[PDB]
Structure formats: C-alpha cells, structure tokens
C-alpha cells in the first residue's frame, strides 16, 4: 500500500534551554485530519520585468500539528525549547529536522498544538529508486 | 626618407614548446622557454616572434605577492618579485591563479579560478599591448575541463578612422 | 581552594601541561652508561633528564633532541630504548693532519649536523702536525663518535655498534683562497677503515606496546628487516579482528637509485623517506625531524598536508649547500611516482652556504591493491589520518542508539513509546553524513546508494539471526586536492 497519502510516525526530542535536559525521541499522534506541510528550498524568487528574478535568503520551514503529550509541560511545545522532529509517511519518504526553533506561538487549549519550525535545512529520504543524486 | 621610419626593435620572447613537451600517463603538456635559431655556420640566435603571447605566459606562470593571513609565511616564499619596487605604473607583477582554495562544490571553485584569470590578464590592456581579452571556461565532467584565452591585437599601421575607443599605445609589436 | 579568605568563589589549579591526546614513540639504540631499562616504554620529560637516562651521544638522545626542538609543546613523547646486538662491531674513521702551519690562522670543521661544528685558532705559526690535532679537545661531547687523538692522526669510532655508524661526509676549510685567515701549508685527509657488522632484530612489539594507542612511530634505524617488523605491527593495529588503535610510522632508506627503489614493499602503513648516497647530514636526524613535525605538533587537523616551504620546513636541520643537486630531476620524478618522499633545500644558492631542507610531497608507500589493481586511495598521508578520524567520529555518533528500543515486523510505534525503526535510523545517519561535507568528506557521487542499513534478520537465513543487530555499509571520499585545467591560448591577430 504505497499510494496512501498519510503520516505514519512522528518523533520529537526536546532540549530545555535553561537546564540542558534532554528527552528521548518520544512518539506522537496528530489531532485531526490535516497533514504537515514543508518547504525545503532556502531561496526565494521575486518576479522582475521580462522574465528576470531576484533571490532572497529565506529559510526552511515546517508545520507540525501534533497532540500534546500529557507528560511534557505545555511551555516546551511553545518557544521555550529546541526541537528535533522526524515524520515518516506511508509511502516511505522520511524527512528530518534538527536544531529547529518555534516561532510566533498561538494560544492552545491544552491538547492541540500547531508548531511552526524553522531550520537551516531539511533532509529528505526518498523511497528506493530515486533519480536525482 | 624611406617610409619605414619606426626604428623600435624587439627583444627576446618566451615561446610555448621551446624545450619540447613533457609526457606523462595523464597527458601531454608543453614546456615553454627560450628558443635558439641556428645559422649555416653556427652563430646561434634567439627568436623574438609572438611578443604578446610570450608576455601572457610570463603573467600566468609566476606567483604574485600572497595576501596576509595572520599566521605568516616563511621569508623564502612570500611571492612576488623584488624588482616591482622600482616601477612607477602602480602595479605588481605575477598572477594569483594558483592561490585558490577548495571552496564549496567543485563548480564554485572552477568559477573562482576563472575570476582570478580575468583579473590577472586584465593587466594586458593596462600596458597597452592588447585592446581586449576574455577567457571562456567550460565544465563537462569530473576530470575533463578546458579553458581558452582570447586576445585581440591590432595592425602596425592605422587603417580605420573614427574609433569609439583609443588606439592602444605600444602597438609597434602589432599583436 | 578551601582557604582562610572565604569568598563566594573557590578555585583550584592542578598542573601546566594538558595536551595528552597526542602521543609519539621514538625507538633507537643506547649505550652502556644509560640507566633506562631496555625494552620498556617510558615517558620522556624535557631535555634535562637526557644523557643520564639514555647515555652520552647515543642514537636515541640525538633523535630525541631534535624531536623536542621541533615540537616545543602540544605533544607527548615516549621512548623505547634498545640495546646493541651480541657481536656488534663499531665503525672506525680516520682523519690525518699533515704539514706545518707556517702562518697564523684558524681551522673550522662541519660534521654530521650544524650543532657539532667547531672552530679553533691555530696556536701560532710553525706549529707541527702534532700540536695541531687539538680538534679532539674541541669536538663536542654529544658527537656520536669518540676521538682518540693519536700521534698525528685522530680516529673516530662509533659509540653504537651495527650498520648505523656508516654515514659521513666531512666539509672543511683548509685549502683554497677561502682565507678566513686560513693557516697556509695545512691539509687534511679523510678515509674509512672499518664498517659496522650486526644490527638487532627485536620482534616483541606485541608485548611492550600491547593495547596502547600511539599516533606516530619514529624508527631511528636502517635495517630493512627491523622496519618490516614495525610495518607488520602497525597492520595489526588497523586489523579487523579487534578494536583498532590506528597509527603511522616513519622510516628512511639511503643509497643509490637502484637500491632505494628495491625497498618498495607496497606498505600503506609507512612513509619511507629517500636520501642520496652523499647526504651531508646524519640520516636519522632528518627522519626524526620529519616525524616530529608531522607528529601532530601540526597535524591536530587530519586534513592538513605537511608539504611546501611553509608547512614542511625542517628548520632545526642546517646543512651547507651541496655542489650538485644530489637527486637529479629525472630521478626525483621516478621516486615520487614510486611512492617515496623526497626532500631538498628551501633556498637558492650553490655557494656552500647554509640552508634548510623541506619536503616536496607528503606521500605514503601505497601502490596497487589487495586485488592487485592500481589506485591512489591511500596515496596521501592525510588519507590515513582522515580515515582514522572518520572511524572515531562515526562511532561516537552511533552511540545514541545504544539501549534504544527498536521495532521491526511492525513499524508503527505506539503513542508515548521511545524507539525507532530502520528507515528512521537510516534517515538520521544520512543527515550526519551530509553535514560533514567539507570537513571529512567531499560531495558524494550518489548519496542515495553509498549508505545502506539492513537488519541482521535480512542477512542470516530463517531462525538464524540475532535480535537487534544491524549492518551499516558506507562509502565516502576525502576532499579534492587540486585538478588540471589545460589551457588553449589564442592571439587572434585579425579583428572581428
């Protein structure tokens, strides 16, 4: 079953900034029917006149809606801790992020959290039989 | 008097393949140097053809002064030439193409090498030997890479009128 | 720390030297008076302890003196003294002085290395050959040779037996217009009378250096069999049958071109240094300098290459300029193509003035392969250092999977469980490998095919594998040290 568009495993690893504590790669589950969205190219093109373009720095962004683990303070899920995430889709694609940070957190009711993460780069592992190197 | 009024002569000139080629398993390369010409009764003499081409070789095949690093260099190999402290044209001799360092992917390093090559041969226009120079470099694989240098010369006697630019001085070498 | 002046903070220093992560081992002969026990590795402190601990003018002391003078600090030294063979003979050299000094002047000699040079003034005019030969009273004690000062002729006898005492070529000023107020009418003749006989062949490396890690091995000898034993030991340190200690060795070979090329045993664990038959410096002194300079006193960065006039300058060695290059250019190319290391002067002159040597190419003695194919995988010495660094660094990274729950045959991990599966593990490793591009690897040709992870259940047949064992297969490539760009000049005399 390789044509199913869905998420299989979500692993996160927090790192408290003020105490250096580290929590193993706990697993998570998603709150609703939405899926994470990704952006892996760290350059943005602006449209000039007559087909030209302009490049801008930009970053690599992630969006990870996940159910809060009842054994971790809600603050950690917001911008009070480092994050290291991994998402494994059903088809086989695996995408890893390290040294990410949360930006502009919004209020949450205690169960559903929608983290927005940014990192230098995101590594993608395509299923067997890729074309590009 | 006779129309051949230009009395300026031409001295020795380094030439490619003067001392033959050095062959190795990787490929064949030239060994530039001075050329000896022989008469019918001995009396050897040095050749002086292709002045600009010979001058270009001197620029490329000579290390220029190395940039300061904060750690320093041994006095033997700081680069440059001690005779450049007397010239008045406000320039230093040699080239820096050999001082590049492996940076990023191979594509970036090759691009940097081309930048240095233009920045070194640009001195030719300053002296006035040639009116324009450009280098085209192509990348086609891991091990095969080529570069071609194009120089533009002029004839000894002016023929065209109404040039946008200027007639290069020191054009008596006609190249 | 705990003191009378109570304050919010307490401090506690312990000692000065701290760079114990780098080690070097020096091996050589000793003399009778040495108090150090033979065949026992012992740490070496500064030069004060020398002489007494290893004898006066012994081979080991001279090698150690250069090692300390090159690496002032940042490395830790060790010594492995060895004793002479049972029936070793000592070489003897003769230096006869003739004529009567009929003018005031001075005599100066250069032997072995600049540190042993002497300069004395002829007592006065009309001093015969016997009052002369006072040179014996001037020769420095550290010289490995003993002067007897016989009647009119001075005899030099090696302080250590074996073939190690068969290398000399003297430079003097007692003739010609080099009138450093030279004493007119004096001459000197140099000749050899007896060579060395027997060298030791220790083979107990597995017992005295057992399970101890060293970075650079230095060997102050020229016995081929002795060097071969060292190579075999190093292989064992790189073997796959046990945890590895890694390391690298430095040796030298001296003789004509035909002789030197005959020592190419195709060993990637050694860096053989080639010298000519008329080298004006004692061989092992140069070898020690090269080893010490590359003995991590500069190579804390594995990527660094010890070459050129800037990084590969053996400053401590001073030798007068020779009258001929020694290694003809047609011979230098052959030695480099055969995996040898060649050194030469770092400055230009032919005057007989003083210069220093530097190293052209930092290359091991690696050629061909186990399957007999030719390649340059371990050509540069930096490859060996980088390979060791990758092995250690990679092992540390994988440590985080020790004691971690692993799920196979059902890849869905329950909520709240701390674990991982094959695909997630492979993805994490790929992230580490890519980030190190430009530090330990160059860009991979195909990163999707040069890394593979398979559980042991997929290798062994049914009901034979073990639970929780993986096989990791990886291929990499060190950085790129240059490339060739053939140029095609064009003057284009015509315009447009």
Question: Could you characterize what this model shows?
Answer:
The structure is cut from a larger assembly and holds chains A (133 residues), B (175 residues) and C (496 residues). By secondary structure, chain A is mostly beta strands. Helices cover 3% and strands 44% of the residues of chain A. Chain A has one helix at residues 74-77; strands spanning 7-12, 15-16, 26-27, 37-39, 44-47, 53-56, 60-67, 81-89, 94-102, 112-119, 123-125. In chain A, strands 1, 2, 3, 4, 7, 8, 9, 10 and 11 form a nine-stranded antiparallel β-sheet that branches. In chain A, strand 5 (44-47) and strand 6 form a beta hairpin. The relative contact order of chain A is 0.26. Chain B contains three helices and six strands, in the order ββββαααββ. Chain C has 496 residues and is an alpha/beta fold. Chain C has ten helices and 22 strands. In chain C, the strands form seven sheets. Chain C has a six-stranded mixed β-sheet with strand order 2-3-1-11-12-13, sandwiched between helices. The radius of gyration of chain C is 29 Å and the shape is elongated. Classes of the chains: A mainly beta (133), B alpha+beta (175), C alpha/beta (496). At the B-C interface, helix 1, helix 2 and strand 6 of B face helix 7 and strand 22 of C. Chain C: This is Tail sheath protein. Chain C: It comes from Agrobacterium phage 7-7-1.
Write the layout of secondary structure elements.
The structure is cut from a larger assembly and holds chains A (133 residues), B (175 residues) and C (496 residues).
Chain A: E1 7-12, E2 15-16, E3 26-27, E4 37-39, E5 44-47, E6 53-56, E7 60-67, H1 74-77, E8 81-89, E9 94-102, E10 112-119, E11 123-125
Antiparallel strand pairs in A: 1-3, 1-8, 2-8, 4-7, 5-6, 7-10, 8-9, 9-10, 9-11
Chain B: E1 21-23, E2 28-30, E3 36-39, E4 42-46, H1 51-60, H2 106-121, H3 123-127, E5 132-139, E6 145-152
Antiparallel strand pairs in B: 1-2, 3-4, 5-6
Chain C: E1 23-29, E2 42-43, H1 59-70, E3 76-82, E4 92-98, E5 106-110, E6 118-121, H2 135-138, E7 145-147, E8 153-158, E9 171-172, E10 187-194, H3 205-208, E11 216-219, H4 224-237, E12 248-254, H5 257-261, E13 270-275, H6 283-297, H7 308-311, E14 319-320, H8 329-337, E15 343-345, E16 354-355, E17 357-359, H9 381-398, E18 405-406, E19 419-420, H10 422-435, E20 451-455, E21 470-474, E22 486-490
Parallel strand pairs in C: 1-3, 1-11, 11-12, 12-13, 18-19
Antiparallel strand pairs in C: 2-3, 4-8, 4-10, 5-6, 5-9, 7-8, 14-16, 15-17, 20-21
Protein name (chain A): Structural protein
Organism (chain A): Agrobacterium phage 7-7-1
Protein name (chain C): Tail sheath protein
